[PDB]
């Protein structure tokens, strides 16, 4: 079980960006691209709700650094209480786990494509 509302992507985003400082090397920029990609889903939720994606993402990132509670997320219904526990929003973890696997493993095949041969219909 996990709690939705953009709280899962923000929690997993800061964990990847923290490892980028320890590893460094040539892959330091690889963890940054994966961390910025996870934040796109919470920022997309703020676009359809007419919010500021910058102010919303900065609040979620500052909350996870101050406290360890991962239940803070984006509210598109605007009932207040960014805590997902009070809003009851719940998502399956098996669903959110496949979102990262299907997105990462598909981009691995796309980036390997060099010569593109397309026949005429």
């Amino acid at each position: 079980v996990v709690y939705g509302g953009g709280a899962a992507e923000v929690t997993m985003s800061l964990a990847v960006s923290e490892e980028a400082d320890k590893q460094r090397g040539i892959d330091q920029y690889a963890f940054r691209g994966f961390a910025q990609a996870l934040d796109t889903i919470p920022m997309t939720l703020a676009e359809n709700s007419g919010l500021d994606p910058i102010g919303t993402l900065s609040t979620l990132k500052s909350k996870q650094l101050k406290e360890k509670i991962s239940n803070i997320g984006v509210d598109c219904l605007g009932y207040g209480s960014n805590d997902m526990k009070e809003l009851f929003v719940v998502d399956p973890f098996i669903g959110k786990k496949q979102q990262i696997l299907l997105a990462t493993q598909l981009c691995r095949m796309i980036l390997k494509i060099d010569n593109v041969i397309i026949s005429g219909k």
């Binding site: 007419g50 919010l51 509210d75 219904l77 605007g78």
Partner: protein, 44 residues
């Protein structure tokens, strides 16, 4: 927080600005290979 303030309309200019940046960066990519002493000439 939602449903209030204003809602954005005519979002095509948001796509027009993207189409203008992508088309301008595509031109800057061909000239980019000519930058610096290692650049190459462009025959037209």
């Amino acid at each position: 927080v939602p449903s209030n303030a204003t809602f954005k309309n005519k979002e095509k200019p948001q796509e027009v600005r993207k189409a203008n940046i992508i088309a301008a960066r595509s031109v800057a990519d061909a000239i980019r290979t000519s930058l610096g002493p290692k650049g190459m000439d462009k025959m037209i």
